[PDB]
Each structure stands twice: as C-alpha cells, then as structure tokens.
C-alpha cells in the first residue's frame, strides 16, 4: 500500500495508491500566532495567527514548514505511519536539483520511508490523458505552468511560469464583490468567496458581448447563501473573475494571459514539433475547471496560431486531480515496485540517487 | 477549567484510534469504531466507559449502521465524551476522520453538565489531530445521520458509512 | 459661481467654488420613522427614527436616499437652485463606472445642472499638497483608503480599503467610557462622545509607555462639560480610542492598521516608484486630525520599510477638508470652464460622457 | 487638469535650450543654463519669469556653481516650474541633459500648490524630450547636489557641473 | 564637429568625434501601446506598451522604426541638428548592400546630413587595438559575431554569427534567479536583473570546480540592493549566467559556444593565415566584459587548436565601446575630411556612392 502525495502550491492532495480520488485535500499552509497550526487547523483560528505558504509557487522555499505539512499529512490526514508505506512525491516543473535531493533526504531520514519516488506533475497529467507528446497547461493555486512535453520528457527551455492562478482570482473576486455592497475581508470570508468562485464562476466565450448581456437583463444573476443564512446576488462578477486569466491587466499585471503563455511556450520549441503541440494541449489543475474555459482557450489560441494549424484543447473531466490520479495508478502497478528508491539504495548513493532513478 | 485530567488509558486508546498501523486482518477487526469516555468515581480523571465501544469487526456482522447503535450507547440522563471514527464520502473524495462528540443532554443533572462542559477544553487539547467536533444537547441533535454529515462537510457529503444520505 | 460637493461616507461637505471653507458640513444620513429627514434634521429627533447611510463606505448603495441628500444640499444647505450653477462632484477611489454614469444622469435629469464634473477625492488631496506622485492615506468617517498616485493617476490595483475610520472610533470611545461609570448609549449622547473625541483624543507615540504614565499620575486627565452642565473626566481613554487605528484588534478586527495598510499598498506598486511613495505619504480626512498621528505613522512605517528608505509623512494643517478646498480652487479657475461637461454634450453622448471628459 | 495653457514664449525658450545650433561663441554664451516658469497675472498661461535665468556665459565668470545659484532663485513661499540644463559625468560617459524641476514648497499658499500641481502634467507634455523630472517640496530636497545626481543616474554619477560629488 | 553613431543590436552609442566616451547610450527600442516611444521613454512606461527591436540582430529589419531611433538620437540624445554635422555610421558584419544604400539615402534625404560615412564595427575594434590582421569576437546585446580580418578587410566567407549575447544572458539570469525564490518578470525588474548581471556576474575558469566551491561554502555569495531597499543574495548564479556563452545548451540551443564559434571561423580561413588569427583574437562588445572571460577563452581555444599553436586572447580594458572610440578618433582626424561622402557626391552618384567610397 503506497502513498501518493501531490504537493501543490496552495492545496495538498494525499491518498493511497489504487484509489480513484485522494483521501485528504487540505490547504498547504502553516500558521503561527501574530504555536504552529497546519492545514485546516490554521484556517479554523482565522485572524489570530498569520499564514505562510512554504511551497507558495510550486517550489518549496521553507523546508522547516514543509516538514510540518508532511508530518500533518501522514499522521493527521492519511492517519498512517510513513515508515510502513512507500511514498510517491510530485514536483513542479523547473524544480531545482537541490530541492529533489532535499525531498529525498527528508523522506528517508525524518520519516524513514521504506521506498520513495519523485514524479513531475505535468508528465503525470499528460500520461493520464493517454499522451506522451503535448503541452500541459497546469493552472493551480499559486502558479500556472505551460509545460511542453516530447516523448515523456519536458523541455525545460520552453517551460513558462505564470504567477496567476486561483489564489489571485479569489482575491480579485473579493475586490469586485465590494462594488455590489458586500464586504469580504476576513480569512473566514475569503473561504466563502472561494466557494462562490468554484460554484458560480464561468469563462465567457466573448467577454464584451457577455458584459452587454449582463447589463441588459438579469438572466446571468445567481443567488448564493452565506453560512449564517444571508443570501447575496452575483451578476457579471461570475465571468469577470476568471477573465483575469486571459486579461491579467485586470489585476495590474504586465504578464500575458494563459492563452498567450501557452502560445509563447509552443513557439519556444522546435518547429518540427509545434504542429503536434497545437493539437495536444491538455488542461490540468483546479483553476482550469471553469465551464467554457476549453472553448475560450481554443478560440484565443486559434487567433494567435497560423490558420493552417489545427488547434485542439483537451479538457478531461477529471483534470482537477489528474496529477494525483495518474500518480496513484502508477504507484499501484506491480511492475512499478522495481522503480522505487529503496532505503538500501539511499544508504549507498545518498540523496543523489534520485537523479538517476527518477530523472 | 475544572482541573480534571485525562487518564493514560484514554490517551492510549485515542492514539491507537488515530494512526492506523499495518496489521493482520484479525487485528484490523479489533480496531475501535466508537468509544465513550466518562468521569471516574472520584471525578478526578477522564476514563474509558467499560463495555461501551464499537469494534470495526462488529460492523457488517452484528452492527448494520454503526452510527445508529453508537447513539443508543449514549445515556439519556448523563453526560459523556465520545470518539467516533466517521467514514464518509464527499463529491470528490472518500474520507475517514475522527469526530469528537460532546453529549450533554438537558435531562442530565446540573452537576454532571457543569463538570463535563468546564473540562471539555482540557481533554480536547490532549487529543491533538481531531478536526471535527459535535456538541449535542438533546437526542434530536445526535440521532439524525444528516446532522453528523453537516458537521463533517456540510452539503458536500453525499454518503455516510457507505449509505447515501 | 460653481458648486463643490464632497460626498463623504459620513459627512457631506458643500460650498461655492473660490471659498476657503465649505459652506455646509452636515451628516449624510437619511432617517425614516421606526416621514423622511436628511442631515441634522434626522439627528434632531434622535431616537424616534432609524438612520441609514446611503454612501456608508464611500460607494453609494442607495441612490434614492442619495438624491434626498443632494436635494437637501442644494436647497436647504447651500440655499441655491442647482439649475443655475455648475456642480463639481467627488467620488471615492475604486468607484464603479456604473456609479459615475448614475451620478451624471441624476445631476442632469433630476437637478438639471448646466454643467457637471467628477473628481477623485484622493487626487484632489495630493494636488492640494503640491504633488503629482505619492500615496494618500484618506481616513474619513466610514472608510479609510490608501491611494497610491503616480503622475496624477491612481493605481487601482494597489488601492487598499480599510473599513475602520472615525465612525468606529466614536463607537469604541462610547464603549470604553462605560468603564469609568459613564453611560452614553443614545443618539444624542453619541454626538457628545464624538465632540469629546475631536477635542481630547490624541495618538500616543509609544502606547505602552503612555499607558504606564497615565496609570501613575493624573497629568493626562482632562475635564469635559456636558450640554446639561455635568462635568466628566477622561484619562487614558484619550489615546486608547485612536490607538484602534494602529491596532484594529482592539475592535475585534483581523485587518491591519493604517500604517500596515499604507505599507502594503506601497508594496503592491512598481519597485521603481516605491522610493517616491515612501517620501510622499500625504494624510487626508478628518480622522487624521489627531495630534501626534503624523509622528506615529512615521515611526510605524519606518519599522516596516527597509532602513535605507526615507520615510516622510505629510500632514498639512488643512488636510481635514483638503478634498473640498482642492475642488473649490480647481472649479474657480477660468481655464477650468472648458473642462465642464455641458448639458449639450450630455444630450448627445448620454451618461457615458463622464468617462472621456472626467476619466 | 486645470486647463492652464503654455505660452509660446516658454515653448520657444525650451526649443532653444533643447537643440543646440552651430553658433559663434558669442551666441553660445547667450544659451540658457537655467530658467524659471511662473503663472501669469490672470493665471491662464505659464509664462517666463523675467530676470530669473542663468546664462551659459555667466558660468565660470560670475557664477561658480550653476546649481547652487539656481536654487537661490527659487521662491521660498511660491511654486515654480524650472528647466535646468545639467552637465554631469557618469563612470563611462559625459552627459548633458535637461532636467524639469517642479518646485512646490510646503510654505507656499495652497492655491498656488493646487494650480501648479494640477497643470504640471499639461506643460510637461508640451516639453517633449525631457527624461529627468525632479519634484521638490522643501528646500532640503533641492539644495543638495547629491539629490540631483541621484535622479540623473543614481550612484553612477561621479561628477556634477565639473566638480566631484 | 562630426557625429559618431554606433547602431548596436540592443544599445545605441552616440557622441561627438574627438570625445573619449559616447555622450548617449540608450536602448534601441521603439514602443507602441498594447503613440510611439523611443529609447528610455519606451522603458519608462514599462508594461503599458510593447517593445520592438528594429536592428534586433545587428541587421536593420524595420527602417521606419530605425528612423525614429535616429531622430531620437540627434534631437533628444545628442541635442544637435543633423544637417549641421557630418555623421559616421557603423554597420554589422555581413550587412547586405541594400541596407548600406538605404542608410545612405535616409541620412541625406531625411536628415540632410552634409557628409556621411559607413564603417564596419569589427574593423574599428581591430584598429583600436593596433592591429590590421586578426579575428574579432564581438559579443553585443542581440548577436555575437566572430569576424576574421586580414589586412583591414573582413573575410565574409569565414564570418560566423551567433544569436546568443547579453540579451539572452539577462533572460537566463531571470529564469535561474527564480530558483532562489525571487521573482523578476516585469519590464522594470528586467532592468534590475541586467544591473545585477553587469555588476556581480563573472566567468569561471573551471565551471565544475567552481560549482563545487559554491556548494560547500558562502564565499562566492554577494548581496544586491533593490531600488526599493530590499536586499537579495546571489550565489552560484554569478558564474552560471555567463556560462551559457560557452555552453549554449543551458538555453536549449544547439549552437556551439563562443570559443568553438571563434575556432570554427578561424578554420574557415586560409591555412597560411590561421597562425596569425590564433595569436590576434580580440574581444569586443559589452558581453565580453565579464571578469575572467579572457582566461576562459584562452583555455577553451587552446584545447581546440593544435598544441603547437600560440593562442593569445586580447581583451583591452576599453573593449566595451571600442567600436565607437575607434570611430570617434577616425572621424576627428583632419586627414579624414576627404573620406566623407559629401551631399554633392550623393546628388550625382545616388545612394550607390557608398560602395566605392566606404567599401
Ligand atoms: N470547480 C472549480 N472551479 C474553479 N476553480 C476551482 C475549482 N475547484 C478548485 N478550484 C481552484 O483551484 C485552486 C487549487 O487547485 P489545485 O490545482 O489543486 O492547486 P495546486 O495544484 O496549486 O495545489 C484553488 O485555489 C481553487 O480556488
Ligand atoms: N479634530 C478632529 N479630530 C479627530 N477626529 C475628527 C476631527 N474632526 C473630525 N473628525 C472625524 O472625522 C470623521 C469624518 O471626517 P471626514 O473625512 O469629513 O468624513 P468623510 O470624508 O468620510 O465624509 C468624523 O467621524 C469625525 O469623528
Ligand atoms: N560590465 C558588463 N558586464 C557584463 N555585461 C555587460 C556589461 N556592460 C554591458 N553589458 C551587456 O552588454 C550588452 C550590450 O552591449 P553592447 O555591445 O554595447 O550592445 P550592442 O549589441 O548594441 O553593441 C547589454 O545587454 C549588457 O547586458
Ligand atoms: Mg498542482
Ligand atoms: Mg472624504
Ligand atoms: Mg556593437
């Protein structure tokens, strides 16, 4: 019984290999008083403590807080002993080689895992879609990545990182909901706005046409019930919040949208493989779960690519946890048991063994 | 803060209930599904109520719905602490979480209610890792399955103990 | 003779262009029995009615009550006909474009003003200080805003709004005066407490040191005379009431203080312009009139900013009405007569004319 | 935007200061090193302040430090627009750039501060080609040579007006 | 008083003949909104506009934008009238003959220059070093050229062009600085990274040995202060960024390094002159100013050349602007006045006069 842990920028997905869905999905935060709370415990205290993201942008920056999340994952969330189960970890694209060794060292020395493995999040998403060549647009919580992959190997020189994801959209929805008279400023109210975003927001195919429609009628207005029973109404904010993905200038950012970032990363690859990447664009992450985002991406990339190229956007229905589900099936295979990094191998080669066993 | 301490037996039982160790299926059937805690005779420690527990192996053979029979174990005119291992499924995950239940019925004597309520924040701080708490003050607030489901994940819960709501 | 109206969250400032001070300063409240009273009339009957703020947080939420305030402003306060004078209106930062058009439509159709104009309150305060680049900390009655401005244009993505201002401080002083045995609960007694706050409250440079000083002697105690002749004594409440601006936890709020809000808005701007914003922090509004608030803000921001940055807090003596005085001088200029939105222009372009004439 | 326009005299003076034409050394001495702009009596145009200017020929004979005497021309309790031709040397170049200076002292009346600030973005748009802007609101922010050097090139500036910092 | 303009790929060097250093050094960019800004003005607006390089790779591709840069050079940077001074222009190696005539036509018809001249950038660098025979490794902003010259004439068949220079190194430094947790993505932050590169980066003689040294201590770490006062620390990125010059695979490029490009261009020359080129390798451009680049080039070329060949790399201390300094001295000579192309000669022979007067 292996363990699969998906260390996302804002949410940690954990579970057991062979299961269809992760067992625990909790925020990856560590809270300290303004003495240490991890996950939902840090959010239950609300405003007394201050929250920090150790893996804020996919890359672990605070290893002391990262071990607290892992300890909370194994004992409080998965409710298992890490020394009895092999653990499969996932890493963000362009992860430095030092972080891979630090991840391996912590697993074998702090938690004494019998076996250990590292997989790239983008490659697992592409494999879960039945492809070995393509570009993955992974939009998570704190970071968005466009990772072109050729024959199962990501092209590091063409990987583009965008610091615009669901965390920024939640903050933007809070900002634009105040124009209707509502006030969401506290930590508890931020979770309410995130729930509104995940239930009522959608991507408009034509933003300007949709704005005119919402300003002439009330067919786009939806009602949401607050935890205390109060009911609020949201209108054009449903499609204005996810529009910041395609128009980052709504957030005051000079960066390009997710459609132009995808096009730019394709243009950084070899000319002979760009045709395959255009027709094999796979969406992944929670921020790609907005209805109508696949059609909007198809329309936007088509306007950028030459008219002779066939643009195909792949949005599998289970793309929210495609990184974890792919890792769980891979770790549950009987033929995969030879691919684990055993503790015996770690004792001989040290933390550097991960470079030759997991690439 | 009444100064009531937690006995080492309760701590040992909670630690066994929280973290699951790799064991033979014979030992898996001996895992506790639910357990009750009560005050001692001298009212100085929180001890295990003998005989008031549910085993995992009993579920499906002698116990059909583990939550329904767990509620029956709660005394009508006495306060009690409970530890329930709830197995439920949301729209995107199957979860198994421990639930701390404070049973303080209105029919209970005032002395029992005061001591249990004032010492609840002391025992719960020793049982680290519990993220769900259910405070029930009458039989109608604990007998309903949907009441537990609301505390677990609200409307996101679609199944409880393998049965749809 | 143009009219300048400053629609604040809790107080309305109105007057004639070219004058040094506004002619009328009355509360912006519309009261109805528990049939409609506006301004001081609503406060004169005290408790028989309920009071509502249509512009409670700088943004107009009830346009029906807003027209009542404007009608009371022109006919009862300014005692002039709105159809004979151009009117210059002020708006809060991050005001939605729909509200700007609604303001233009009401001015031209309900009051038939010959000319009409909209100015941002924060920009007028910065101009009145002789600056085009800087950050304005506008603390009013119902809302506090930190508006960074670069070359006369506010940066909307860096504007931070704090729902903590003089209205909350008046309530807090009401609460802490009960610890001395006094009882202020009624609407009439609230105005007495507000008068005490505006006359005897001050910001302490060191709160903990000042608290020890007040607990060891009586040199900080002041006497206040009630309207009925009774005399009350206030001691340590003089500096505890405005301390809630820097420690919002005194009010049970999870938000940061005005010093941290100012620092946070600066850090949301471009790195190349942060040095200018640090040395060009301008205070505005009535809630910034506490003695010692400029020195306290300088000390607090210095502890947050890097030691190599020069922190300069600008607190002009006339900053209480700097929004109105800036608007009155601007509207009284002969060169400004071509900036007005004429009724002829409104009849052609409709309410949308305000977007291209007033930005 | 106060609607205050820029007089043709200011535009002509700026055009002469920006582009240097091949001229006899007698006419080179007549080039303007610094000049002040002020509002007219009717406050409708930005005009040249008569007598408040520094000529290139005056530098080195009657004027020792061109920047020190230019600062003395700034009124203590009045706002003013200034155009300073700064001659400075970096670590790898000797530069000669025009500096637009907005002088708005805190002691000035608020009416002057409001009009000058609100009309600054209009005059600066007419003076195309200026890449340096100094906004001084007190005497300490304009009298120091190091303040101008920081705005010109930061720490890369090693000399100003032929004298090391 | 003649004018010397060095039209580089990313930076324009301009000044007056006879001066030791150019008066103006500004980026050669033209910005238009996402109505036209040239040079530092285009970078002052940051992200509101898009930047285009008209001479991106040494060869002018957009002549409309090139005239804007030249107009900005004469009037805004040099602050002189082009019709009153002769202008000496520089051109990249392998510049097509059509571009030489187009440059001559623009100077005489658009700017009405009294006299005009074109010089090759590589030849001016070699002459400034006191040589007429040798190979010049000119590494600039957008392009790197290895130009072997024999008796003052460049050998066009042996000139090799490398699309790898300081512009690619600035982008690479931004990419690898994110591994330390920093985020430089905006246009303003790119100029900060370029300043870091020009101040703290150096070429390591042994890259693998230097990498081990940086991973075992902190003696190679340097601190840099951001414009807003924050201090960042850079370690092994100091020598990893310029290492992409010798290992282009760090950027995902299949091309060879600057050492192999220099060796390959020597091997394309006559065998009898290869001995002179080995001992007369002259470095030029801003990208060759990394400390330790001459020693690394000497070591790398030695391993490629036969052991009997004497390898000598010439790195003059003023090689950053050797193209401009050589042009300024040449244009200031009284004997050079008869080398100019007069307007009278242009009126008779047309733009083709440049081929026989400037070769
Ligand atoms: N149905 C949904 N619609 C829109 N956004 C969603 C939905 N579900 C989750 N999200 C967003 O996805 C973000 C995190 O998703 P995930 O990809 O797991 O993040 P990470 O991979 O960084 O851990 C959250 O901020 C959340 O707001
Ligand atoms: N001298 C003073 N000292 C402290 N607070 C004051 C003073 N004068 C006014 N205030 C406070 O300022 C608040 C309103 O000021 P103002 O900025 O005009 O409000 P708004 O701009 O929101 O209409 C009032 O609640 C009042 O308590
Ligand atoms: N001291 C330095 N160290 C390293 N790189 C430098 C240095 N000075 C300038 N550069 C780099 O040189 C590049 C341009 O140099 P230059 O050769 O003048 O450009 P061009 O290609 O226009 O001739 C810039 O991108 C800059 O990053
Ligand atoms: Mg992820
Ligand atoms: Mg106000
Ligand atoms: Mg060059």
Swiss-Prot record, chains A, C, E:
Keywords: Acetylation, ATP-binding, Cytoplasm, Cytoskeleton, Deafness, Disease variant, Dystonia, Hydrolase, Intellectual disability, Isopeptide bond, Methylation, Nucleotide-binding, Nucleus, Oxidation, Ubl conjugation. It is found in: Cytoplasm, Cytoskeleton; Nucleus. Changing residue 167 to W: In DDS1; likely pathogenic; results in reduced actin polymerization rate and increased depolymerization; results in higher ATP hydrolysis compared to the wild type; does not affect thermal stability; modifies cell response to latrunculin A. Changing residue 55 to A: Decreased interaction with SETD3. ISGylated. It catalyses: ATP + H2O = ADP + phosphate + H(+). The modification Tele-methylhistidine is found at residue 57. Changing residue 95 to D: In CSMH; uncertain significance; somatic variant. One of its GO terms (cellular component) is extracellular space. Its EC number is 3.6.4.-. SUPFAM superfamilies: Actin-like ATPase domain (SSF53067). There is a cross-link at residue 254 ((Microbial infection) Isoglutamyl lysine isopeptide (Glu-Lys) (interchain with K-50)). It holds the Pfam family Actin. It is linked to Dystonia-deafness syndrome 1: An autosomal dominant form of dystonia with juvenile onset, associated with congenital or childhood-onset sensorineural deafness. Dystonia is defined by the presence of sustained involuntary muscle contraction, often leading to abnormal postures. Some DDS1 patients have dysmorphic features, skeletal anomalies, and/or mild developmental delay with impaired intellectual development. In vertebrates 3 main groups of actin isoforms, alpha, beta and gamma have been identified. The alpha actins are found in muscle tissues and are a major constituent of the contractile apparatus. The beta and gamma actins coexist in most cell types as components of the cytoskeleton and as mediators of internal cell motility. Polymerization of globular actin (G-actin) leads to a structural filament (F-actin) in the form of a two-stranded helix. Each actin can bind to 4 others. Identified in a IGF2BP1-dependent mRNP granule complex containing untranslated mRNAs. Component of the BAF complex, which includes at least actin (ACTB), ARID1A, ARID1B/BAF250, SMARCA2, SMARCA4/BRG1, ACTL6A/BAF53, ACTL6B/BAF53B, SMARCE1/BAF57 SMARCC1/BAF155, SMARCC2/BAF170, SMARCB1/SNF5/INI1, and one or more of SMARCD1/BAF60A, SMARCD2/BAF60B, or SMARCD3/BAF60C. In muscle cells, the BAF complex also contains DPF3. PANTHER family: ACTIN (PTHR11937). Actin is a highly conserved protein that polymerizes to produce filaments that form cross-linked networks in the cytoplasm of cells. Actin exists in both monomeric (G-actin) and polymeric (F-actin) forms, both forms playing key functions, such as cell motility and contraction. In addition to their role in the cytoplasmic cytoskeleton, G- and F-actin also localize in the nucleus, and regulate gene transcription and motility and repair of damaged DNA. This is Actin, cytoplasmic 1. The gene is ACTB.
Curated annotation (Swiss-Prot), chains B, D:
The modification Phosphothreonine is found at residues 24, 62. Coiled coil: none annotated. GO terms for cellular component: actin cytoskeleton; cell-cell junction; cofilin-actin rod; cortical actin cytoskeleton; cytoplasm; cytosol; dendritic spine; extracellular exosome. It comes from the Eukaryota. A motif (Nuclear localization signal) lies at residues 29-33. Gene3D superfamilies: Severin. It is a peripheral membrane protein. There is a cross-link at residue 131 (Glycyl lysine isopeptide (Lys-Gly) (interchain with G-Cter in SUMO2)). Widely distributed in various tissues. Residues 3-152 form the ADF-H domain. Keywords: Acetylation, Actin-binding, Cell membrane, Cell projection, Cytoplasm, Cytoskeleton, Host-virus interaction, Isopeptide bond, Membrane, Nucleus, Phosphoprotein, Ubl conjugation. Inactivated by phosphorylation on Ser-2. Phosphorylated on Ser-2 in resting cells. Dephosphorylated by PDXP/chronophin; this restores its activity in promoting actin filament depolymerization. The phosphorylation of Ser-23 may prevent recognition of the nuclear localization signal. Phosphorylated via a ARRB1-RAC1-LIMK1-PAK1 cascade upon active ligand stimulation of atypical chemokine receptor ACKR2. The keyword Cell inner membrane does not apply. It is found in: Nucleus matrix; Cytoplasm, Cytoskeleton; Cell projection, Ruffle membrane; Cell projection, Lamellipodium membrane. The modification N-acetylalanine is found at residue 1. GO terms for biological process: actin cytoskeleton organization; actin filament depolymerization; actin filament fragmentation; actin filament severing; cell projection organization; cellular response to epidermal growth factor stimulus; cellular response to ether; cellular response to hydrogen peroxide. PROSITE patterns: ADF_H. The modification N6-acetyllysine is found at residues 12, 72, 143. The modification Phosphoserine is found at residues 2, 7, 40, 107, 155. The modification Phosphotyrosine is found at residues 67, 81, 139. Binds to F-actin and exhibits pH-sensitive F-actin depolymerizing activity. In conjunction with the subcortical maternal complex (SCMC), plays an essential role for zygotes to progress beyond the first embryonic cell divisions via regulation of actin dynamics. Required for the centralization of the mitotic spindle and symmetric division of zygotes. Plays a role in the regulation of cell morphology and cytoskeletal organization in epithelial cells. Belongs to the actin-binding proteins ADF family. Can bind G- and F-actin in a 1:1 ratio of cofilin to actin. It is a major component of intranuclear and cytoplasmic actin rods. Interacts with the subcortical maternal complex (SCMC) via interaction with TLE6 isoform 1 and NLRP5. Interacts with C9orf72. This is Cofilin-1. It comes from Homo sapiens.
